[PDB]
Design an enzyme around this catalytic site. Structure first.
Site, PDB file in Angstrom:
ATOM      1  N   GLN A   1      36.981 -17.358  13.801  1.00  0.00           N
ATOM      2  CA  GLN A   1      38.203 -16.454  12.644  1.00  0.00           C
ATOM      3  C   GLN A   1      38.217 -15.830  11.109  1.00  0.00           C
ATOM      4  O   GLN A   1      38.414 -14.891  10.656  1.00  0.00           O
ATOM      5  CB  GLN A   1      39.496 -17.476  12.437  1.00  0.00           C
ATOM      6  CG  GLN A   1      40.020 -16.972  14.077  1.00  0.00           C
ATOM      7  CD  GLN A   1      40.632 -16.120  14.624  1.00  0.00           C
ATOM      8  OE1 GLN A   1      41.593 -15.588  14.322  1.00  0.00           O
ATOM      9  NE2 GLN A   1      40.211 -15.756  15.824  1.00  0.00           N
TER      10      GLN A   1
ATOM     11  N   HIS B   1      50.579   1.260  24.951  1.00  0.00           N
ATOM     12  CA  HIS B   1      49.257   1.426  23.712  1.00  0.00           C
ATOM     13  C   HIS B   1      48.362   0.552  24.379  1.00  0.00           C
ATOM     14  O   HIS B   1      46.886   1.132  24.567  1.00  0.00           O
ATOM     15  CB  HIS B   1      48.492   1.881  22.322  1.00  0.00           C
ATOM     16  CG  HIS B   1      48.895  -0.150  22.153  1.00  0.00           C
ATOM     17  ND1 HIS B   1      49.805  -0.793  22.228  1.00  0.00           N
ATOM     18  CD2 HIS B   1      47.391  -0.711  21.738  1.00  0.00           C
ATOM     19  CE1 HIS B   1      49.787  -2.042  21.184  1.00  0.00           C
ATOM     20  NE2 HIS B   1      48.685  -1.684  22.237  1.00  0.00           N
ATOM     21  N   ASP B   2      48.321  -0.495  25.724  1.00  0.00           N
ATOM     22  CA  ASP B   2      47.498  -1.159  26.361  1.00  0.00           C
ATOM     23  C   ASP B   2      48.538  -1.442  27.970  1.00  0.00           C
ATOM     24  O   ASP B   2      48.158  -2.023  28.529  1.00  0.00           O
ATOM     25  CB  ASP B   2      47.788  -2.883  25.321  1.00  0.00           C
ATOM     26  CG  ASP B   2      46.605  -2.673  24.445  1.00  0.00           C
ATOM     27  OD1 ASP B   2      45.822  -2.297  25.153  1.00  0.00           O
ATOM     28  OD2 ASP B   2      47.163  -3.751  24.099  1.00  0.00           O
TER      29      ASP B   2
ATOM     30  N   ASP C   1      48.421  -2.905  15.828  1.00  0.00           N
ATOM     31  CA  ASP C   1      47.969  -3.807  16.248  1.00  0.00           C
ATOM     32  C   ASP C   1      47.137  -5.050  16.373  1.00  0.00           C
ATOM     33  O   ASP C   1      47.062  -5.486  17.524  1.00  0.00           O
ATOM     34  CB  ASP C   1      46.062  -2.834  17.728  1.00  0.00           C
ATOM     35  CG  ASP C   1      45.939  -2.638  19.403  1.00  0.00           C
ATOM     36  OD1 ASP C   1      46.871  -3.869  19.255  1.00  0.00           O
ATOM     37  OD2 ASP C   1      44.363  -2.824  18.924  1.00  0.00           O
TER      38      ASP C   1
ATOM     39  N   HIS D   1      53.227  -8.109  23.415  1.00  0.00           N
ATOM     40  CA  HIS D   1      52.549  -7.196  22.202  1.00  0.00           C
ATOM     41  C   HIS D   1      53.119  -6.193  22.629  1.00  0.00           C
ATOM     42  O   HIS D   1      52.697  -5.491  20.803  1.00  0.00           O
ATOM     43  CB  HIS D   1      50.977  -7.607  23.050  1.00  0.00           C
ATOM     44  CG  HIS D   1      49.496  -6.702  22.035  1.00  0.00           C
ATOM     45  ND1 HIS D   1      49.871  -7.262  21.320  1.00  0.00           N
ATOM     46  CD2 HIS D   1      49.286  -5.716  22.690  1.00  0.00           C
ATOM     47  CE1 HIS D   1      48.903  -6.440  20.597  1.00  0.00           C
ATOM     48  NE2 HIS D   1      48.625  -5.630  21.599  1.00  0.00           N
TER      49      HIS D   1
ATOM     50  N   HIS E   1      46.853  -9.289  25.867  1.00  0.00           N
ATOM     51  CA  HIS E   1      47.649  -7.788  26.369  1.00  0.00           C
ATOM     52  C   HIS E   1      48.387  -7.841  27.277  1.00  0.00           C
ATOM     53  O   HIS E   1      48.201  -7.193  28.255  1.00  0.00           O
ATOM     54  CB  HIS E   1      46.145  -7.419  26.328  1.00  0.00           C
ATOM     55  CG  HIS E   1      44.603  -6.963  25.168  1.00  0.00           C
ATOM     56  ND1 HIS E   1      44.379  -8.029  25.417  1.00  0.00           N
ATOM     57  CD2 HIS E   1      44.848  -6.590  24.727  1.00  0.00           C
ATOM     58  CE1 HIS E   1      42.779  -7.439  24.732  1.00  0.00           C
ATOM     59  NE2 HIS E   1      43.940  -6.905  23.564  1.00  0.00           N
TER      60      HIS E   1
END
Ligand SMILES: Cn1nc(-c2ccccn2)cc1NC(=O)c1nc(C2CC2)ccc1Nc1cncnc1
Ligand SMILES: [Mg+2]
Ligand SMILES: [Zn+2]
Length: 314
Positions: free
Chosen positions: A268, A105-106, A216, A71, A67
Protein backbone atom coordinates in the site's frame (compact mmCIF):
# COMPACT_ATOMS: atom_id res chain seq x y z
CA UNK A 1 -41.59 17.22 -14.66
CA UNK A 2 -40.50 14.30 -12.44
CA UNK A 3 -37.26 15.10 -10.53
CA UNK A 4 -35.24 12.31 -8.83
CA UNK A 5 -34.61 13.03 -5.11
CA UNK A 6 -32.56 11.47 -2.27
CA UNK A 7 -33.02 11.25 1.50
CA UNK A 8 -31.64 14.40 3.25
CA UNK A 9 -28.37 12.75 4.42
CA UNK A 10 -27.60 11.50 0.86
CA UNK A 11 -28.71 14.83 -0.79
CA UNK A 12 -26.08 16.81 1.25
CA UNK A 13 -23.23 14.22 1.45
CA UNK A 14 -23.28 13.12 -2.27
CA UNK A 15 -21.67 16.58 -2.87
CA UNK A 16 -18.54 15.56 -0.78
CA UNK A 17 -15.78 13.76 -2.78
CA UNK A 18 -15.54 11.11 0.02
CA UNK A 19 -19.25 10.00 -0.20
CA UNK A 20 -19.79 6.17 0.00
CA UNK A 21 -22.88 5.07 -2.06
CA UNK A 22 -23.75 2.52 0.69
CA UNK A 23 -24.63 -1.21 0.78
CA UNK A 24 -28.21 -1.14 -0.70
CA UNK A 25 -27.75 -2.14 -4.38
CA UNK A 26 -31.36 -1.07 -5.28
CA UNK A 27 -30.48 2.58 -4.43
CA UNK A 28 -27.52 2.81 -6.87
CA UNK A 29 -29.50 3.32 -10.15
CA UNK A 30 -31.48 6.07 -8.28
CA UNK A 31 -28.19 7.70 -7.10
CA UNK A 32 -26.70 7.54 -10.68
CA UNK A 33 -29.86 9.07 -12.39
CA UNK A 34 -29.87 11.88 -9.73
CA UNK A 35 -26.20 12.56 -10.49
CA UNK A 36 -27.04 12.71 -14.28
CA UNK A 37 -30.10 15.04 -13.68
CA UNK A 38 -27.87 17.51 -11.70
CA UNK A 39 -24.55 17.44 -13.72
CA UNK A 40 -26.05 17.04 -17.26
CA UNK A 41 -29.72 18.19 -16.96
CA UNK A 42 -33.14 16.37 -16.93
CA UNK A 43 -33.25 16.76 -20.79
CA UNK A 44 -29.95 14.90 -21.65
CA UNK A 45 -31.61 11.43 -21.82
CA UNK A 46 -35.17 10.00 -22.18
CA UNK A 47 -35.71 8.57 -18.64
CA UNK A 48 -37.10 5.23 -20.03
CA UNK A 49 -34.04 4.54 -22.31
CA UNK A 50 -31.68 5.51 -19.43
CA UNK A 51 -33.43 3.08 -16.97
CA UNK A 52 -33.29 0.30 -19.64
CA UNK A 53 -29.57 1.04 -20.50
CA UNK A 54 -28.59 1.22 -16.72
CA UNK A 55 -30.23 -2.20 -15.91
CA UNK A 56 -28.63 -3.88 -19.02
CA UNK A 57 -25.22 -2.44 -17.88
CA UNK A 58 -25.83 -3.76 -14.30
CA UNK A 59 -26.65 -7.25 -15.72
CA UNK A 60 -23.28 -7.45 -17.66
CA UNK A 61 -21.15 -6.66 -14.52
CA UNK A 62 -20.06 -9.88 -12.77
CA UNK A 63 -20.33 -10.69 -9.01
CA UNK A 64 -16.54 -10.41 -8.46
CA UNK A 65 -15.17 -9.03 -5.17
CA UNK A 66 -13.95 -5.55 -6.46
CA UNK A 67 -14.39 -4.95 -10.28
CA UNK A 68 -18.23 -5.02 -9.92
CA UNK A 69 -21.41 -2.87 -10.23
CA UNK A 70 -20.65 -1.01 -6.92
CA UNK A 71 -17.20 -0.04 -8.36
CA UNK A 72 -18.85 1.32 -11.61
CA UNK A 73 -21.29 3.61 -9.66
CA UNK A 74 -18.51 4.66 -7.17
CA UNK A 75 -16.22 5.74 -10.11
CA UNK A 76 -19.18 7.62 -11.75
CA UNK A 77 -19.86 9.39 -8.40
CA UNK A 78 -16.22 10.60 -8.26
CA UNK A 79 -16.65 11.99 -11.84
CA UNK A 80 -19.94 13.70 -10.70
CA UNK A 81 -17.94 15.52 -7.92
CA UNK A 82 -15.07 16.58 -10.32
CA UNK A 83 -17.71 17.76 -12.89
CA UNK A 84 -19.84 19.76 -10.33
CA UNK A 85 -16.77 21.68 -8.86
CA UNK A 86 -15.36 22.52 -12.36
CA UNK A 87 -18.71 23.11 -14.15
CA UNK A 88 -17.34 25.95 -16.39
CA UNK A 89 -14.59 23.75 -18.02
CA UNK A 90 -16.65 20.90 -19.63
CA UNK A 91 -18.93 20.76 -22.75
CA UNK A 92 -22.48 19.20 -22.97
CA UNK A 93 -21.20 16.07 -24.81
CA UNK A 94 -18.42 15.62 -22.16
CA UNK A 95 -20.84 15.76 -19.15
CA UNK A 96 -23.20 13.25 -20.99
CA UNK A 97 -20.36 10.88 -22.11
CA UNK A 98 -18.07 10.79 -18.99
CA UNK A 99 -20.69 9.69 -16.40
CA UNK A 100 -21.67 6.92 -18.93
CA UNK A 101 -17.96 6.03 -19.61
CA UNK A 102 -17.51 5.65 -15.78
CA UNK A 103 -20.58 3.36 -15.36
CA UNK A 104 -19.44 1.16 -18.35
CA UNK A 105 -15.62 1.27 -17.80
CA UNK A 106 -15.20 -2.30 -16.33
CA UNK A 107 -18.18 -4.08 -18.10
CA UNK A 108 -17.92 -7.90 -18.02
CA UNK A 109 -14.75 -7.84 -15.84
CA UNK A 110 -13.93 -11.35 -14.51
CA UNK A 111 -11.29 -10.21 -11.91
CA UNK A 112 -8.14 -10.86 -14.06
CA UNK A 113 -5.53 -8.37 -15.42
CA UNK A 114 -4.38 -7.88 -19.07
CA UNK A 115 -1.13 -9.85 -18.12
CA UNK A 116 -3.07 -12.98 -17.01
CA UNK A 117 -5.20 -12.90 -20.24
CA UNK A 118 -1.84 -12.70 -22.26
CA UNK A 119 -0.11 -15.57 -20.31
CA UNK A 120 -3.35 -17.68 -20.45
CA UNK A 121 -3.72 -17.07 -24.23
CA UNK A 122 -7.34 -15.89 -23.70
CA UNK A 123 -8.92 -15.34 -27.19
CA UNK A 124 -9.41 -11.59 -26.32
CA UNK A 125 -5.55 -11.21 -26.21
CA UNK A 126 -5.37 -12.16 -29.95
CA UNK A 127 -8.29 -9.73 -30.76
CA UNK A 128 -6.84 -6.76 -28.72
CA UNK A 129 -3.01 -7.02 -28.22
CA UNK A 130 -2.85 -4.09 -25.66
CA UNK A 131 -5.37 -2.56 -23.21
CA UNK A 132 -7.09 -5.97 -23.87
CA UNK A 133 -9.75 -5.70 -21.08
CA UNK A 134 -10.32 -1.96 -21.72
CA UNK A 135 -11.10 -2.51 -25.47
CA UNK A 136 -13.52 -5.35 -24.43
CA UNK A 137 -15.28 -2.98 -21.90
CA UNK A 138 -15.85 -0.45 -24.76
CA UNK A 139 -17.05 -3.16 -27.20
CA UNK A 140 -19.58 -4.32 -24.51
CA UNK A 141 -20.68 -0.62 -24.06
CA UNK A 142 -21.40 -0.46 -27.87
CA UNK A 143 -23.28 -3.84 -27.86
CA UNK A 144 -25.68 -2.57 -25.14
CA UNK A 145 -26.27 0.82 -26.92
CA UNK A 146 -27.33 -1.19 -30.06
CA UNK A 147 -30.06 -3.16 -28.20
CA UNK A 148 -33.70 -2.19 -29.03
CA UNK A 149 -34.92 0.75 -26.81
CA UNK A 150 -31.38 1.25 -25.34
CA UNK A 151 -29.85 4.05 -27.51
CA UNK A 152 -29.68 6.85 -24.86
CA UNK A 153 -27.89 8.97 -27.55
CA UNK A 154 -30.91 8.79 -30.04
CA UNK A 155 -31.67 12.58 -29.91
CA UNK A 156 -28.00 13.45 -30.93
CA UNK A 157 -26.89 14.30 -34.52
CA UNK A 158 -24.84 11.76 -36.56
CA UNK A 159 -21.55 13.70 -35.94
CA UNK A 160 -22.30 14.38 -32.21
CA UNK A 161 -23.09 10.65 -31.59
CA UNK A 162 -19.64 9.89 -33.13
CA UNK A 163 -17.89 12.51 -30.89
CA UNK A 164 -19.62 11.26 -27.66
CA UNK A 165 -18.68 7.59 -28.55
CA UNK A 166 -15.05 8.81 -29.12
CA UNK A 167 -15.07 10.56 -25.69
CA UNK A 168 -16.38 7.28 -24.09
CA UNK A 169 -13.87 5.07 -26.06
CA UNK A 170 -10.78 7.15 -25.00
CA UNK A 171 -12.07 7.62 -21.40
CA UNK A 172 -12.51 3.80 -21.06
CA UNK A 173 -9.07 3.03 -22.67
CA UNK A 174 -7.46 5.62 -20.29
CA UNK A 175 -8.31 3.31 -17.27
CA UNK A 176 -5.52 0.95 -18.51
CA UNK A 177 -3.00 1.90 -15.73
CA UNK A 178 -0.07 0.87 -18.07
CA UNK A 179 -1.03 4.10 -20.03
CA UNK A 180 -1.42 6.35 -16.90
CA UNK A 181 2.38 6.60 -16.18
CA UNK A 182 3.06 8.11 -19.67
CA UNK A 183 -0.10 10.29 -19.58
CA UNK A 184 0.80 11.75 -16.12
CA UNK A 185 4.49 12.49 -17.14
CA UNK A 186 3.24 14.37 -20.29
CA UNK A 187 0.55 16.37 -18.33
CA UNK A 188 3.19 17.20 -15.60
CA UNK A 189 5.75 18.59 -18.19
CA UNK A 190 2.96 20.47 -20.13
CA UNK A 191 1.85 22.04 -16.77
CA UNK A 192 5.40 23.01 -15.50
CA UNK A 193 6.30 24.43 -19.06
CA UNK A 194 2.98 26.41 -19.47
CA UNK A 195 1.95 24.69 -22.80
CA UNK A 196 -1.20 22.86 -21.44
CA UNK A 197 -4.21 24.13 -23.52
CA UNK A 198 -7.81 22.99 -22.75
CA UNK A 199 -8.76 24.20 -26.32
CA UNK A 200 -6.32 21.59 -27.81
CA UNK A 201 -8.37 18.30 -28.21
CA UNK A 202 -5.25 16.04 -27.64
CA UNK A 203 -4.72 18.00 -24.32
CA UNK A 204 -8.42 17.62 -23.32
CA UNK A 205 -7.97 13.86 -24.04
CA UNK A 206 -4.97 13.64 -21.60
CA UNK A 207 -6.77 15.59 -18.78
CA UNK A 208 -9.97 13.43 -19.13
CA UNK A 209 -7.65 10.37 -19.05
CA UNK A 210 -6.15 11.63 -15.77
CA UNK A 211 -9.66 12.35 -14.35
CA UNK A 212 -10.51 8.66 -15.23
CA UNK A 213 -7.41 7.31 -13.33
CA UNK A 214 -8.37 9.55 -10.34
CA UNK A 215 -11.99 8.26 -10.43
CA UNK A 216 -10.96 4.58 -10.92
CA UNK A 217 -8.57 4.75 -7.83
CA UNK A 218 -10.97 6.93 -5.69
CA UNK A 219 -11.16 4.04 -3.16
CA UNK A 220 -7.87 5.46 -1.66
CA UNK A 221 -9.68 8.87 -1.21
CA UNK A 222 -12.48 7.63 1.19
CA UNK A 223 -12.83 7.64 5.02
CA UNK A 224 -10.22 5.21 6.42
CA UNK A 225 -12.74 2.40 7.31
CA UNK A 226 -14.10 2.45 3.68
CA UNK A 227 -10.50 2.42 2.21
CA UNK A 228 -9.33 -0.42 4.54
CA UNK A 229 -12.43 -2.66 3.94
CA UNK A 230 -12.15 -1.98 0.15
CA UNK A 231 -8.48 -3.25 0.12
CA UNK A 232 -9.76 -6.74 1.24
CA UNK A 233 -11.94 -6.81 -1.94
CA UNK A 234 -9.04 -5.85 -4.29
CA UNK A 235 -6.59 -8.40 -2.69
CA UNK A 236 -9.28 -11.16 -2.91
CA UNK A 237 -9.07 -10.63 -6.74
CA UNK A 238 -5.24 -10.16 -6.91
CA UNK A 239 -4.64 -13.38 -4.89
CA UNK A 240 -7.15 -15.43 -6.99
CA UNK A 241 -5.19 -14.17 -10.08
CA UNK A 242 -1.80 -15.11 -8.50
CA UNK A 243 -3.18 -18.64 -7.78
CA UNK A 244 -4.16 -18.95 -11.51
CA UNK A 245 -0.60 -17.71 -12.47
CA UNK A 246 0.87 -20.48 -10.21
CA UNK A 247 -1.47 -23.02 -11.96
CA UNK A 248 0.10 -22.00 -15.32
CA UNK A 249 3.49 -22.74 -13.58
CA UNK A 250 4.43 -18.99 -13.39
CA UNK A 251 5.48 -17.01 -10.27
CA UNK A 252 2.98 -14.14 -9.82
CA UNK A 253 4.40 -10.67 -8.93
CA UNK A 254 4.29 -10.04 -5.11
CA UNK A 255 0.97 -8.06 -4.93
CA UNK A 256 -0.87 -11.17 -6.34
CA UNK A 257 0.76 -13.79 -4.03
CA UNK A 258 -1.48 -14.65 -0.98
CA UNK A 259 1.69 -15.99 0.74
CA UNK A 260 2.82 -12.28 1.01
CA UNK A 261 -0.42 -11.31 2.96
CA UNK A 262 1.75 -9.74 5.76
CA UNK A 263 3.48 -7.28 3.35
CA UNK A 264 0.09 -5.69 2.39
CA UNK A 265 0.75 -2.46 4.41
CA UNK A 266 4.25 -2.10 2.81
CA UNK A 267 2.70 -2.70 -0.66
CA UNK A 268 0.00 0.00 0.00
CA UNK A 269 2.83 2.42 1.00
CA UNK A 270 4.55 1.52 -2.35
CA UNK A 271 1.26 2.07 -4.31
CA UNK A 272 0.39 5.49 -2.71
CA UNK A 273 3.96 6.87 -3.36
CA UNK A 274 4.57 5.46 -6.90
CA UNK A 275 0.94 5.96 -8.25
CA UNK A 276 -1.90 7.53 -6.16
CA UNK A 277 -0.05 10.62 -4.72
CA UNK A 278 1.48 11.65 -8.10
CA UNK A 279 -2.04 11.14 -9.67
CA UNK A 280 -4.03 13.37 -7.23
CA UNK A 281 -1.09 15.89 -7.05
CA UNK A 282 -1.06 16.45 -10.91
CA UNK A 283 -4.93 16.54 -10.98
CA UNK A 284 -4.99 19.21 -8.18
CA UNK A 285 -2.42 21.30 -10.22
CA UNK A 286 -4.59 21.17 -13.39
CA UNK A 287 -7.98 21.26 -11.49
CA UNK A 288 -7.46 23.10 -8.13
CA UNK A 289 -11.00 22.37 -6.75
CA UNK A 290 -10.22 18.53 -6.74
CA UNK A 291 -7.93 19.35 -3.70
CA UNK A 292 -9.89 17.05 -1.28
CA UNK A 293 -9.01 13.88 -3.34
CA UNK A 294 -5.27 14.62 -2.65
CA UNK A 295 -5.85 15.63 1.01
CA UNK A 296 -7.81 12.37 1.61
CA UNK A 297 -5.20 10.26 -0.33
CA UNK A 298 -2.41 11.75 1.95
CA UNK A 299 -4.52 11.08 5.13
CA UNK A 300 -4.95 7.33 4.19
CA UNK A 301 -1.14 7.17 3.32
CA UNK A 302 -0.49 8.46 6.86
CA UNK A 303 -2.95 5.72 8.12
CA UNK A 304 -1.00 2.92 6.31
CA UNK A 305 2.24 4.15 7.98
CA UNK A 306 0.40 3.86 11.36
CA UNK A 307 -0.43 0.18 10.43
CA UNK A 308 3.27 -0.65 9.62
CA UNK A 309 4.34 0.90 13.03
CA UNK A 310 1.79 -1.29 14.96
CA UNK A 311 -0.37 1.80 16.03
CA UNK A 312 -3.32 0.40 13.88
CA UNK A 313 -4.74 -3.14 12.94
CA UNK A 314 -5.80 -4.69 9.54
C1 LIG B 1 1.04 -1.79 -6.97
N1 LIG B 1 0.60 -2.58 -5.82
N2 LIG B 1 1.53 -3.27 -5.08
C2 LIG B 1 0.84 -3.87 -4.11
C3 LIG B 1 1.51 -4.79 -3.17
C4 LIG B 1 2.85 -5.17 -3.35
C5 LIG B 1 3.40 -6.10 -2.47
C6 LIG B 1 2.62 -6.66 -1.48
C7 LIG B 1 1.29 -6.26 -1.40
N3 LIG B 1 0.73 -5.35 -2.22
C8 LIG B 1 -0.54 -3.61 -4.23
C9 LIG B 1 -0.66 -2.78 -5.32
N4 LIG B 1 -1.79 -2.17 -5.93
C10 LIG B 1 -2.87 -1.75 -5.19
O1 LIG B 1 -2.94 -1.88 -3.97
C11 LIG B 1 -4.01 -1.14 -6.01
N5 LIG B 1 -3.92 -1.29 -7.35
C12 LIG B 1 -4.91 -0.82 -8.15
C13 LIG B 1 -4.81 -0.97 -9.65
C14 LIG B 1 -4.80 -2.33 -10.31
C15 LIG B 1 -3.56 -1.52 -10.29
C16 LIG B 1 -6.02 -0.17 -7.64
C17 LIG B 1 -6.13 0.02 -6.28
C18 LIG B 1 -5.14 -0.47 -5.41
N6 LIG B 1 -5.28 -0.32 -4.01
C19 LIG B 1 -6.49 -0.02 -3.31
C20 LIG B 1 -7.74 -0.11 -3.92
N7 LIG B 1 -8.89 0.19 -3.30
C21 LIG B 1 -8.77 0.59 -2.03
N8 LIG B 1 -7.64 0.72 -1.32
C22 LIG B 1 -6.51 0.41 -1.97
MG1 LIG C 1 -10.60 -1.62 -15.53
ZN1 LIG D 1 -12.13 0.29 -12.56
Amino acid sequence: LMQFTLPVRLCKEIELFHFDIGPFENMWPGIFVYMVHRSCGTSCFELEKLCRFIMSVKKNYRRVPYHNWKHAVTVAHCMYAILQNNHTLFTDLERKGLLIACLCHDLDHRGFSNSYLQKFDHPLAALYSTSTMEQHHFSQTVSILQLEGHNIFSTLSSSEYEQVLEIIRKAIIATDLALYFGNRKQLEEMYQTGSLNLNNQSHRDRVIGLMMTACDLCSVTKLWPVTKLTANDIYAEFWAEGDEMKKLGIQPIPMMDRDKKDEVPQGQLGFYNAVAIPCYTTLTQILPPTEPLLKACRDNLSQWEKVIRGEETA
